[PDB]
């Protein structure tokens, strides 16, 4: 028992983290096989940053320039190439401590773990969602860009997104790791609109059912409700509307504690009108979204 | 800019995880050097359980009963010890992968990390504090036990916890590597009270000037208070009585803002006599104990 915002062990990612140097910028890289994967901004001067010529900027560089380091030893690039905003240096040595691993897109709402890096070196991990706008509330300050988002199944790790930038609102923005942004987000220091962002409903469900079974159950009630009448309220407390997918995948805790989706949908709709009444569910005050269903099914029993 | 709840990250502790089976039970050990540390209660059977005669019970066991496997290497145990309520497994290979390490008896309201284990196997990573009443909130099923908490200097983990029990209440409990509980706990399936807890204010006035650092102000007021005056606020609440040790060590967080540690203090005050208002400090909507001052220094600086 017990519920904890649980990120995945960073082992796997901490061996792959770089330093990569060009010019006075240093940021992270991610050493996978022979290849470095970093943001192209590392190529970027103070003057550069508010709208940067790219591919001007990377044809004065040479594969000498990028000063690539793993922790003492020192990379040797022998190719370098721009793929949307990702720069990908070829290295002369295949890391040695290369996962199993993978590159994925992952949907807004997923979840995932940060290993937040400076210099290379990891400093910490946390989970949390890509927001339905395609930004991420993370902890990055100057030097984290290159971070990389993460997903561990068993052995493989899925590589899912790598930190580029902070919006002007504090809130972070980056790229899957073939480059692409998530959202509408350009790596240029330019004020730049973020979505309006929802809160995600399917992993606010998925959370009442973890407190459920974690013994949390104050919030359960008398009442049923509809698809239609839940997004109903759904859309006046800006919640993403809920879809049969959604109560497909609620489906196994719905199994496990009896309780049907649209009756947990009743009490979510309660508490979305009328509020906590100054309590508390599995810690939070709030209405937490960073678990999906997939999150709380493997907390919930103890998967490795 | 943001502020999030971060593990230090694991690799170092999960290069050290192993599995120890004595008869049916399966549960983590900590390999360091040629060393497996894990939970004395791995030689209980179901009735040994309720109260565990653990010197008899070991007595019956050789060093050939204790099956250690880290992943899928086997090791030889040449040597079995009880100190407290740890066992120590003497193997004939020293860990390769054994970190610089120190062993910690951490104070109440310190933090740490923990790496949730099964079967010798990581399955997450979170960060938690020691409760005024030496319980820690963690999230735990059958089979965790074992698991281990540390912080990281650097190079240097500081094991400080291993985990050994889930109260009736569905808190955790535990020990530091000396196999000494923190608390007044036993390692026996009985109802066992746990001391009344309070919320850690110095972590709590931490966790308000990481939220003015990250832009989260509108808790400042116009007041201030004396510790005398707090204190009484504090005990009405059920938080620790500030000291000058903690005002002290909340020095260079007051130095960075400008605001000093009284005037936080009365920000704490007005939010502890009038709620939040409904409204949030760094994503919660409840005041935040889990940092210490020097998790939001090292956070707010980026230290790797
Ligand atoms: C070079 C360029 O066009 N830019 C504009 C500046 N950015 C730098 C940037 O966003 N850094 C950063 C990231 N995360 C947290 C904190 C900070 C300070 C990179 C992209
Ligand atoms: C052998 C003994 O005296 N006992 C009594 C049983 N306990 C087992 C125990 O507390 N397990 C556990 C730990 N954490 C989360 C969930 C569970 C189920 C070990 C100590």
């Given amino acids: 028992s017990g519920f904890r915002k649980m990120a995945f062990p960073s082992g796997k990612v901490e061996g792959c983290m770089v330093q990569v140097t ?4 240093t940021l992270n890289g991610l050493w996978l096989d022979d290849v470095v994967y970093c943001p192209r901004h590392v190529i970027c001067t103070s003057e550069d940053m508010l709208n940067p010529n790219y591919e001007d900027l990377l044809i004065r ?4 320039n ?5 922790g003492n030893v020192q990379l040797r690039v022998i190719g370098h190439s721009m793929q949307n905003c ?8 295949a890391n040695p401590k290369t996962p199993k691993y993978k590159f994925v897109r992952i949907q807004p709402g997923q979840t995932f773990s940060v ?22 509330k993370g902890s990055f300050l100057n030097g984290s860009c290159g971070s990389v988002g993460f997903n561990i199944d068993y052995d493989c790790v899925s590589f899912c997104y790598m930190h580029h930038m902070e919006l002007p609102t504090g809130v972070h923005a980056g790229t899957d790791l073939e480059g692409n942004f998530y959202g509408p987000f350009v790596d240029r220091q330019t004020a730049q609109a973020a979505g309006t962002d929802t809160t995600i409903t399917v992993n606010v469900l998925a ?19 509809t698809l239609n009448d839940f997004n109903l309220v759904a859309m006046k407390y800006n919640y993403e509307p809920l879809t049969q997918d ?5 489906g196994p805790l719905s199994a496990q504690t009896g309780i049907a989706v649209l009756d947990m949908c009743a009490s979510l709709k309660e508490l979305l009108q009328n509020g906590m009444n100054g309590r ?13 269903p997939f999150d709380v099914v493997r907390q919930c029993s103890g998967v490795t």
């Fill in 22 to 25: 060009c010019g006075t910028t």
């Fill in 61 to 64: 560089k040479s594969n000498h």
């Fill in 66 to 70: 990028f000063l690539v380091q793993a």
């Fill in 86 to 93: 990702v720069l990908k240096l070829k290295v002369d040595t």
């Fill in 115 to 136: 290993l937040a890096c400076y210099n290379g070196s990891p400093s910490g991990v946390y989970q949390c969602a890509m927001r339905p706008n395609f930004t991420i």
């Fill in 207 to 225: 959370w009442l059912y973890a407190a459920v079974i974690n013994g949390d159950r104050w919030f359960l009630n008398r009442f049923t409700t």
């Fill in 246 to 250: 959604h109560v497909d995948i609620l």
């Fill in 280 to 292: 508390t569910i599995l810690g939070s005050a709030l209405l937490e979204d960073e678990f999906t």
